[PDB]
Amino acid sequence: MNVIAILNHMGVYFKEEPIRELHRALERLNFQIVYPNDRDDLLKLIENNARLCGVIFDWDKYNLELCEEISKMNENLPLYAFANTYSTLDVSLNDLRLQISFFEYALGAAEDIANKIKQTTDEYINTILPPLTKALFKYVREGKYTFCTPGHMGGTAFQKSPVGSLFYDFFGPNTMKSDISISVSELGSLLDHSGPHKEAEQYIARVFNADRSYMVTNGTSTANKIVGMYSAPAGSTILIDRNCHKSLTHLMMMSDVTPIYFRPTRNAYGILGGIPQSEFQHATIAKRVKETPNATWPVHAVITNSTYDGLLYNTDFIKKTLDVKSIHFDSAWVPYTNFSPIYEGKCGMSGGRVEGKVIYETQSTHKLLAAFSQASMIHVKGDVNEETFNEAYMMHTTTSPHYGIVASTETAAAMMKGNAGKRLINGSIERAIKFRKEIKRLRTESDGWFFDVWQPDHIDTTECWPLRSDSTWHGFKNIDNEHMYLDPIKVTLLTPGMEKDGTMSDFGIPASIVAKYLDEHGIVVEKTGPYNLLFLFSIGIDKTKALSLLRALTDFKRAFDLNLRVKNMLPSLYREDPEFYENMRIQELAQNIHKLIVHHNLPDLMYRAFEVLPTMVMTPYAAFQKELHGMTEEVYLDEMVGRINANMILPYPPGVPLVMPGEMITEESRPVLEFLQMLCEIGAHYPGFETDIHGAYRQADGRYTVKVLKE
Amino acid sequence: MNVIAILNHMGVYFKEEPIRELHRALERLNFQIVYPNDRDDLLKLIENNARLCGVIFDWDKYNLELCEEISKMNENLPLYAFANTYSTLDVSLNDLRLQISFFEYALGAAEDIANKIKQTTDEYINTILPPLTKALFKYVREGKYTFCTPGHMGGTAFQKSPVGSLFYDFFGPNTMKSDISISVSELGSLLDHSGPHKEAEQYIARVFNADRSYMVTNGTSTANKIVGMYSAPAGSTILIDRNCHKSLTHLMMMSDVTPIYFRPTRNAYGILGGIPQSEFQHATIAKRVKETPNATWPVHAVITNSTYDGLLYNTDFIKKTLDVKSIHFDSAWVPYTNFSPIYEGKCGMSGGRVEGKVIYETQSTHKLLAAFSQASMIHVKGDVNEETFNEAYMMHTTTSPHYGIVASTETAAAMMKGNAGKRLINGSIERAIKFRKEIKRLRTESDGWFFDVWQPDHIDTTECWPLRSDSTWHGFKNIDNEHMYLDPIKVTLLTPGMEKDGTMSDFGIPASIVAKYLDEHGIVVEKTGPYNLLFLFSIGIDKTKALSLLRALTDFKRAFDLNLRVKNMLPSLYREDPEFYENMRIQELAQNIHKLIVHHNLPDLMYRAFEVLPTMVMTPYAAFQKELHGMTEEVYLDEMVGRINANMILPYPPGVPLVMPGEMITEESRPVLEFLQMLCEIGAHYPGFETDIHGAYRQADGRYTVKVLKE
Amino acid sequence: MNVIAILNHMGVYFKEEPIRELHRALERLNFQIVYPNDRDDLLKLIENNARLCGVIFDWDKYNLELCEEISKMNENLPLYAFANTYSTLDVSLNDLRLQISFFEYALGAAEDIANKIKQTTDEYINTILPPLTKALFKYVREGKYTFCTPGHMGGTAFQKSPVGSLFYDFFGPNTMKSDISISVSELGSLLDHSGPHKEAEQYIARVFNADRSYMVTNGTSTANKIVGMYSAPAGST
């Protein structure tokens, strides 16, 4: 905030020489001065920037509707109207409700005007800032010597070493002084929820429409642990989504709990869809309790809302009909929910306080909002035992947190209050929708093949487009109406190779080549399956990045039709093994990997492997207990049927836990083994496209091993 | 690295005009140029700075011993000797082993010389940098657009919001671009230990003399959890130090384990000393196993080495005689051990690979080294199940870590390789010893009272001064010889109020007033007890901070002898309740709090409360299980005998867990209740000195409550 | 390639002060900046020159047909359209098939834009250059000391003699460093047809529509000898 914009030169002297004196005084007060030519120049200057902290304009040539337009753009922005001809009498109430401060044109009075402008800018900065970030900035500005942890003590240890000086010159001084610990008593403490921290969690609670809100400093991988260790005591039972994270599996291995796994649907692409409506009612839950050993009525439920590919649920249905005392939504990919009414009825915090149960939501703030990594939140909705749940939160977090992460966690919510946050969210959603409309437009504009995007055939409104059973763009057969809602900002491109009914085509490009090409040209894809990409259109995405992406896709199309060699187009993949990719064209490589997928029948195996659940011999807690006692042997992959698995098997494709720790592959679940063997067989042909299975360990001969339990 | 220092002007032109042309070319290549006048100027310039990345000197007037001195100062520093009169023949081997590159005095050849200098500086930067920090800096320098998590995507979300722009202008761009996730495939992944990450853990393993080294991104509060969940399966038994952290208690509440608590000694000051030699042999361990219900032979041991006040152990004794299969050292306060031979035989990694057991050490890197917060390491020494322990490490850490913390964690070890790290550690230890010598000197120089420092009466050598049974400076009675070693850099000041034999004096100042005064004058104390301070003399401390601290102590002495009012001297404490501190002098306040300590007999109660162990009714895991089921009631403090505690009671003073979760205060442990009641009684008199007990909850009437279990 | 041409001054400030900051940053990055007045000025400037390596223009006052005309003039030339009023939606396929990179008008963001412009210019140079000339230019830019033939060794023998210095001042340094031999292993060898040389003869074979193409270094007076000594053995006709 040092940019203060003065409107145009009227022409007469008595209201220009005071303006030039104020210009000189403001430059003396370390303010950059910009000179927009007219009104629309000011509108564009304010929307394209954010460092602007003041507008000076004459109240004669520009009326007070150029206070209201800026108010629609930013409510808290100070503007400085200069009163010459309009008297006191010419002011309405709506002018008085805006951030304007009136001044006069007097020669030699520029010093007091500049001091008042500096004070107003300071008030604006101290108004828009959240309280803990405000206090941290104040503490760094009044920077005191310290004799406490951390050891760098304001980064003055990095000023006395060469590699330390490189680190210090990279990061800069303010992010070294911003790292302090709980010994600084004026900032309170995260662990005890005191002072500026307590004001921060109350601020987070207002913003996100939650009763009590927490600010985790390790991540939602730890927030899931906190929620599932509070609400699910040992010996109890949980309803965990099979579409889960590794963190929930880790939680189940720490705690002595027992699962019933929900059964999500999926298409031939490998996109993890959702649980049908039948598996949230009392009948199916009671049945699955009945045929699970050592199982009682579930006391907690964990649901991934949304999925990895951005499929929201009808959460009002869930909160009405799921008859458990605590429903947890692992909303790691949807933290931005409250800030656009598009997502109404699509999160745990949507709607009011539900009766008889506590709704948890564990937004991963760093993922889609603007926050530093390892930042997360736990929003609750209901009544919880305050000391027990506070102690459970204290149990998993560290004792001396990184205050940069905490300040970023709060500043992410502070970016969403007012009109600026609504403008951010609506701009991101509208930009995502416009990108979707041209990618379907360029599909019908181009010749031959082009990238498809997995979205409804007619989208033109800003809403979460519901997945209807009467349409076939999604691919989930016999899907329930109003249970799924596509998130517009998680754009999933598609590549040729798949037909609409689910069978495979002949000409195709698997998405690994497209992702590697985009990585070569300096744009990064989130994660790819066999024939899909994913692009997070968060609040950071502007039209520069969107156009560069669209124009990396087009250059890939041109380079693939021209059929350039692997050496020229993909040097990063060429360097994987130059002997192999020396005389190979890209069309031959794409055709070969596509034929390896087709002949081995990848999508049918990937479907039929996840439509059958492995037999739960013992709870994953018992599997971890037997793993700790050294009762694990590494049998080869083929002889794994009838054996209890000790470590989780997580195959890419698709990215969802296939075999849990403690489950047996029986003869009824042989397509699981066939899929694993097929994936190992196809991954050992072409370098750079190596097999990515978390749990299976590569040997030298080419056959993988899985840690199973001894007999 | 942009500072290149040229030595003096010889006087003749043919070796000055090429030097001026090289000056102009290097300024064209964005290098700051400094001009030391002579040799000693260069020596001082190099020791006082670290951004210097090159010395240009003439090989005639300055010999090659001004290459060896700089080599003793920095081994990798490039220097550029200019050869005029000494021929090829005048070079020895020791000159060739140094970082010198020879040049000549030619007119018009300054461009190639400047390009070679820039290339040599780039080689130097790429040499001293650790590999993962090097790759992260390279990735940010080649900064690519991204469509993946995190949501700010290079900080371009903070460039479009006012509070976001304040955050961005504070932190700066390079620490926003440095936050990326595992989707960037060229940096590998922390979780899978691949690529640049795997090179980083191998680099950490060399540096710290460990077999396998891990880099935790939550902190040693999570590293303790990782170690104690791998090595201690459920149903087993551990030997946990009573001088533990909150994190170890949290670990014991997560896991179904059973303790035998070691019994450390302590003095009247409240400093947590150490476990006697008798409690590490087989006889006492077998006895304490025998009188503990449901207890078997311990399979793991956790020892806080050093203590909070920097008392190292004779760890060779521990690793020889403690007959358990895994010994863990919670070395959160001593991470700098390998980098000075003072600490030989004083860590888990000291000495060779011990036979028959695995030694863990969990250095908190952010505490005393130069690293960002929430950074920690796990060094092992022995043979562990690689996949089981890797899975246990993966179990507690997040999945998308903050790469700034990881890069800082590795750069902290990279600051310690070579001669610069040895110079850092030796300079910090020597500065600590010199500060200790003048604080004892100023004690005998001043009039009346002065601050004492809890250290041996004769210290003049750079060693860990052993706590001898034939001396009484420490206060631990009947202490064992060569079991304790004072760390010189954890300086514990003392205030008047205590006599040498342990009884209380009449004139005294409790350390809270001194800490608050130092906080008023802008220097921060780590943590204080009743009459002691603590100052971490880490690698960040230079003589500026040390002199400012000594000269805040002296100004406090002058202001206390002059007896200034609380309003003028302590406005931050005045604002706590201006009605109470209006007409009170500092001598009256100090005398009143000292009399409250004396009349209530604080040190005798604090001693006798920790010399008696509360009765373990049930394991803390069972206490947490009963706490989760809502079986907890809040009885008042006085009626807590005979009741099983559900939450840990952590009173300040001193800062060590007094009552564990699941333990009963019996009639044999009534002084525990007397100490708690006394602390609550003395904390409810003077504002700003409020009672700090973690576990006891303040009520409105003034009597505290503790969550106990129902009957 | 250091000439980057910016189109005209619109008049409003929010898309001129970022342009002036980008001007200052590009001059800091050693780029000469030219200022064509209007569209036909740019057309004539591009046809009369070849050192131009970039056009910066606003996407509002000048449409995307002033990308297609430059494409007919030079296909690989990078141009930098600045997006203000036309949204994402206003782009056709023929625009996407051209060498344009889109930017925005933001104050204080000229450093990243200038770095991206420098990287795009480097990509353009490494795109239009043939591989062996690219590798030779790279080798001279990373100029290493040598102890092999030729004897001047980067022309440092001509820097130590008066007539040698006249020769060196005439020819200039880059054509002295460009004369090396087969001892530099990273450039391959002409005689054995390896590495960058082999890529060069394959490149010559594509260009001239021939199966196998050779690159003689004495002249076609020697190429005739090569052909007539291969195809015409002694005693034949």
mmCIF file of C-alpha atoms in Angstrom, chain A residues 491-683:
data_model
loop_
_atom_site.group_PDB
_atom_site.id
_atom_site.type_symbol
_atom_site.label_atom_id
_atom_site.label_comp_id
_atom_site.label_asym_id
_atom_site.label_seq_id
_atom_site.Cartn_x
_atom_site.Cartn_y
_atom_site.Cartn_z
ATOM 1 C CA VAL A 491 -11.370 -28.772 -15.170
ATOM 2 C CA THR A 492 -10.704 -32.362 -16.252
ATOM 3 C CA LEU A 493 -9.487 -32.455 -19.829
ATOM 4 C CA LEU A 494 -9.764 -35.645 -21.837
ATOM 5 C CA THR A 495 -7.573 -37.118 -24.532
ATOM 6 C CA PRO A 496 -8.537 -39.349 -27.480
ATOM 7 C CA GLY A 497 -8.703 -43.072 -26.880
ATOM 8 C CA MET A 498 -12.089 -43.527 -25.218
ATOM 9 C CA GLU A 499 -15.481 -43.784 -26.852
ATOM 10 C CA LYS A 500 -18.574 -42.319 -25.208
ATOM 11 C CA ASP A 501 -20.098 -45.670 -24.203
ATOM 12 C CA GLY A 502 -16.910 -46.700 -22.363
ATOM 13 C CA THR A 503 -15.131 -48.870 -24.926
ATOM 14 C CA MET A 504 -11.701 -47.930 -26.238
ATOM 15 C CA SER A 505 -11.029 -46.322 -29.597
ATOM 16 C CA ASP A 506 -8.127 -47.134 -31.922
ATOM 17 C CA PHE A 507 -6.381 -43.757 -32.167
ATOM 18 C CA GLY A 508 -5.430 -42.354 -28.790
ATOM 19 C CA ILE A 509 -2.917 -40.447 -26.708
ATOM 20 C CA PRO A 510 -2.555 -41.399 -23.029
ATOM 21 C CA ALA A 511 -2.395 -38.349 -20.796
ATOM 22 C CA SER A 512 1.171 -39.014 -19.600
ATOM 23 C CA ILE A 513 2.598 -37.723 -22.903
ATOM 24 C CA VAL A 514 0.447 -34.588 -22.755
ATOM 25 C CA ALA A 515 1.441 -33.949 -19.126
ATOM 26 C CA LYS A 516 5.128 -34.454 -19.928
ATOM 27 C CA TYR A 517 4.869 -32.101 -22.899
ATOM 28 C CA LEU A 518 3.188 -29.444 -20.760
ATOM 29 C CA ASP A 519 5.911 -29.889 -18.136
ATOM 30 C CA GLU A 520 8.479 -29.423 -20.901
ATOM 31 C CA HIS A 521 6.837 -26.142 -21.922
ATOM 32 C CA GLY A 522 6.684 -24.872 -18.361
ATOM 33 C CA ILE A 523 3.124 -25.519 -17.182
ATOM 34 C CA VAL A 524 2.353 -28.104 -14.513
ATOM 35 C CA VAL A 525 -0.613 -30.485 -14.425
ATOM 36 C CA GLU A 526 -1.969 -31.507 -11.008
ATOM 37 C CA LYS A 527 -2.203 -35.288 -11.615
ATOM 38 C CA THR A 528 -3.132 -37.427 -14.619
ATOM 39 C CA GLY A 529 -4.779 -40.788 -15.060
ATOM 40 C CA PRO A 530 -4.781 -42.881 -18.221
ATOM 41 C CA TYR A 531 -6.628 -40.390 -20.443
ATOM 42 C CA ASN A 532 -7.485 -37.406 -18.259
ATOM 43 C CA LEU A 533 -5.768 -34.308 -16.934
ATOM 44 C CA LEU A 534 -6.775 -31.991 -14.108
ATOM 45 C CA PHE A 535 -6.317 -28.237 -13.779
ATOM 46 C CA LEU A 536 -7.056 -26.390 -10.550
ATOM 47 C CA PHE A 537 -8.583 -23.047 -11.547
ATOM 48 C CA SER A 538 -8.094 -21.538 -8.110
ATOM 49 C CA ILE A 539 -8.115 -17.833 -7.253
ATOM 50 C CA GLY A 540 -4.551 -17.525 -8.540
ATOM 51 C CA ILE A 541 -5.435 -18.341 -12.144
ATOM 52 C CA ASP A 542 -5.772 -15.334 -14.447
ATOM 53 C CA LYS A 543 -6.262 -15.278 -18.206
ATOM 54 C CA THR A 544 -2.496 -15.228 -18.854
ATOM 55 C CA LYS A 545 -2.080 -18.731 -17.436
ATOM 56 C CA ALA A 546 -5.326 -19.964 -19.015
ATOM 57 C CA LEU A 547 -4.312 -18.755 -22.476
ATOM 58 C CA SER A 548 -0.800 -20.181 -22.086
ATOM 59 C CA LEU A 549 -2.317 -23.546 -21.170
ATOM 60 C CA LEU A 550 -4.747 -23.516 -24.092
ATOM 61 C CA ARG A 551 -1.810 -22.545 -26.333
ATOM 62 C CA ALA A 552 0.399 -25.376 -24.984
ATOM 63 C CA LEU A 553 -2.457 -27.757 -25.805
ATOM 64 C CA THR A 554 -2.663 -26.349 -29.343
ATOM 65 C CA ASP A 555 1.108 -26.508 -29.901
ATOM 66 C CA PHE A 556 1.017 -30.122 -28.744
ATOM 67 C CA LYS A 557 -1.709 -30.777 -31.311
ATOM 68 C CA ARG A 558 0.381 -29.180 -34.060
ATOM 69 C CA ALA A 559 3.528 -31.049 -33.005
ATOM 70 C CA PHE A 560 1.639 -34.355 -32.859
ATOM 71 C CA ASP A 561 0.040 -33.922 -36.280
ATOM 72 C CA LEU A 562 3.448 -32.954 -37.672
ATOM 73 C CA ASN A 563 4.818 -36.000 -35.762
ATOM 74 C CA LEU A 564 8.028 -34.537 -34.403
ATOM 75 C CA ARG A 565 10.658 -36.813 -32.913
ATOM 76 C CA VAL A 566 10.896 -37.493 -29.185
ATOM 77 C CA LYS A 567 14.408 -35.995 -29.090
ATOM 78 C CA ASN A 568 13.325 -32.561 -30.326
ATOM 79 C CA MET A 569 9.952 -32.276 -28.611
ATOM 80 C CA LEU A 570 10.549 -34.071 -25.283
ATOM 81 C CA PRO A 571 14.224 -33.703 -24.299
ATOM 82 C CA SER A 572 13.360 -34.321 -20.634
ATOM 83 C CA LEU A 573 11.900 -37.689 -21.632
ATOM 84 C CA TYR A 574 14.724 -38.180 -24.143
ATOM 85 C CA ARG A 575 17.260 -37.969 -21.302
ATOM 86 C CA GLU A 576 15.540 -40.857 -19.491
ATOM 87 C CA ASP A 577 17.208 -43.299 -21.904
ATOM 88 C CA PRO A 578 18.679 -41.697 -25.051
ATOM 89 C CA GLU A 579 19.424 -45.099 -26.605
ATOM 90 C CA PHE A 580 15.727 -46.036 -26.658
ATOM 91 C CA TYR A 581 14.124 -42.724 -27.707
ATOM 92 C CA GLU A 582 16.719 -41.964 -30.391
ATOM 93 C CA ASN A 583 14.786 -42.814 -33.572
ATOM 94 C CA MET A 584 11.195 -42.831 -32.297
ATOM 95 C CA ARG A 585 8.427 -40.495 -33.421
ATOM 96 C CA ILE A 586 5.738 -39.250 -31.063
ATOM 97 C CA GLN A 587 2.887 -40.885 -33.006
ATOM 98 C CA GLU A 588 4.620 -44.267 -32.762
ATOM 99 C CA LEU A 589 5.164 -43.813 -29.010
ATOM 100 C CA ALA A 590 1.562 -42.749 -28.375
ATOM 101 C CA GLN A 591 0.245 -45.581 -30.552
ATOM 102 C CA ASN A 592 2.462 -48.094 -28.744
ATOM 103 C CA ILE A 593 1.380 -47.085 -25.241
ATOM 104 C CA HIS A 594 -2.249 -46.933 -26.396
ATOM 105 C CA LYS A 595 -1.941 -50.441 -27.858
ATOM 106 C CA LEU A 596 -0.388 -51.638 -24.595
ATOM 107 C CA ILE A 597 -3.444 -50.256 -22.800
ATOM 108 C CA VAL A 598 -5.898 -51.728 -25.352
ATOM 109 C CA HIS A 599 -4.435 -55.244 -25.672
ATOM 110 C CA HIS A 600 -4.135 -55.626 -21.898
ATOM 111 C CA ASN A 601 -7.651 -54.108 -21.517
ATOM 112 C CA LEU A 602 -6.830 -51.526 -18.856
ATOM 113 C CA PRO A 603 -10.223 -49.809 -18.204
ATOM 114 C CA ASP A 604 -12.259 -53.010 -17.865
ATOM 115 C CA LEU A 605 -9.753 -54.413 -15.364
ATOM 116 C CA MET A 606 -9.584 -51.066 -13.536
ATOM 117 C CA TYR A 607 -13.374 -51.104 -13.274
ATOM 118 C CA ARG A 608 -13.850 -54.737 -12.226
ATOM 119 C CA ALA A 609 -11.025 -54.525 -9.674
ATOM 120 C CA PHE A 610 -12.697 -51.680 -7.774
ATOM 121 C CA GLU A 611 -16.208 -53.126 -8.001
ATOM 122 C CA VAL A 612 -15.082 -55.973 -5.700
ATOM 123 C CA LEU A 613 -14.056 -55.342 -2.090
ATOM 124 C CA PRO A 614 -11.185 -57.369 -0.590
ATOM 125 C CA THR A 615 -12.053 -59.554 2.384
ATOM 126 C CA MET A 616 -11.338 -57.902 5.744
ATOM 127 C CA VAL A 617 -9.596 -60.540 7.843
ATOM 128 C CA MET A 618 -8.548 -58.089 10.566
ATOM 129 C CA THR A 619 -8.749 -54.386 11.317
ATOM 130 C CA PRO A 620 -5.895 -52.198 9.980
ATOM 131 C CA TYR A 621 -4.905 -51.419 13.575
ATOM 132 C CA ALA A 622 -4.227 -55.127 14.076
ATOM 133 C CA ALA A 623 -2.371 -55.192 10.753
ATOM 134 C CA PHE A 624 -0.107 -52.384 11.961
ATOM 135 C CA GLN A 625 0.339 -54.197 15.284
ATOM 136 C CA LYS A 626 1.451 -57.367 13.503
ATOM 137 C CA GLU A 627 3.657 -55.266 11.213
ATOM 138 C CA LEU A 628 5.468 -53.674 14.162
ATOM 139 C CA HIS A 629 6.271 -57.091 15.667
ATOM 140 C CA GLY A 630 8.231 -58.125 12.576
ATOM 141 C CA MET A 631 5.628 -60.639 11.379
ATOM 142 C CA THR A 632 5.876 -59.430 7.765
ATOM 143 C CA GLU A 633 7.404 -61.251 4.805
ATOM 144 C CA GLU A 634 7.848 -60.064 1.221
ATOM 145 C CA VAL A 635 6.156 -62.642 -1.005
ATOM 146 C CA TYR A 636 6.094 -61.989 -4.742
ATOM 147 C CA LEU A 637 3.068 -60.416 -6.394
ATOM 148 C CA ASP A 638 1.609 -63.534 -8.036
ATOM 149 C CA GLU A 639 1.402 -65.610 -4.829
ATOM 150 C CA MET A 640 -0.454 -62.984 -2.792
ATOM 151 C CA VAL A 641 -3.945 -64.537 -2.825
ATOM 152 C CA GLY A 642 -4.972 -65.915 0.542
ATOM 153 C CA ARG A 643 -2.413 -63.685 2.282
ATOM 154 C CA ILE A 644 -3.165 -60.824 4.662
ATOM 155 C CA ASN A 645 -1.703 -57.535 3.447
ATOM 156 C CA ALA A 646 0.369 -55.482 5.879
ATOM 157 C CA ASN A 647 1.014 -52.297 3.880
ATOM 158 C CA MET A 648 -1.486 -50.376 1.779
ATOM 159 C CA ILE A 649 -1.390 -50.886 -1.989
ATOM 160 C CA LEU A 650 -2.016 -47.574 -3.774
ATOM 161 C CA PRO A 651 -1.777 -47.948 -7.570
ATOM 162 C CA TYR A 652 -1.483 -45.082 -10.031
ATOM 163 C CA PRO A 653 -3.902 -45.261 -12.000
ATOM 164 C CA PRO A 654 -6.151 -44.149 -10.462
ATOM 165 C CA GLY A 655 -5.008 -42.826 -7.078
ATOM 166 C CA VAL A 656 -7.409 -44.411 -4.597
ATOM 167 C CA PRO A 657 -6.541 -47.113 -1.991
ATOM 168 C CA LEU A 658 -7.176 -50.490 -3.592
ATOM 169 C CA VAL A 659 -5.998 -52.976 -0.934
ATOM 170 C CA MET A 660 -6.095 -51.778 2.661
ATOM 171 C CA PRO A 661 -3.705 -52.987 5.382
ATOM 172 C CA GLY A 662 -5.243 -56.108 6.898
ATOM 173 C CA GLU A 663 -7.353 -57.286 3.949
ATOM 174 C CA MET A 664 -7.068 -60.511 1.953
ATOM 175 C CA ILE A 665 -7.388 -60.971 -1.797
ATOM 176 C CA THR A 666 -9.637 -64.009 -2.158
ATOM 177 C CA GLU A 667 -10.751 -65.910 -5.254
ATOM 178 C CA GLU A 668 -13.780 -63.605 -5.452
ATOM 179 C CA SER A 669 -11.354 -60.668 -5.789
ATOM 180 C CA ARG A 670 -8.962 -62.162 -8.352
ATOM 181 C CA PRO A 671 -9.449 -59.211 -10.816
ATOM 182 C CA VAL A 672 -7.607 -57.094 -8.216
ATOM 183 C CA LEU A 673 -4.584 -59.363 -8.679
ATOM 184 C CA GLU A 674 -5.105 -59.360 -12.452
ATOM 185 C CA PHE A 675 -5.155 -55.542 -12.482
ATOM 186 C CA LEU A 676 -1.991 -55.340 -10.364
ATOM 187 C CA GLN A 677 -0.167 -57.875 -12.548
ATOM 188 C CA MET A 678 -1.354 -56.097 -15.708
ATOM 189 C CA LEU A 679 -0.114 -52.744 -14.402
ATOM 190 C CA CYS A 680 3.272 -54.251 -13.546
ATOM 191 C CA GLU A 681 3.410 -55.907 -16.982
ATOM 192 C CA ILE A 682 2.646 -52.720 -18.914
ATOM 193 C CA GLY A 683 4.911 -50.495 -16.840
#
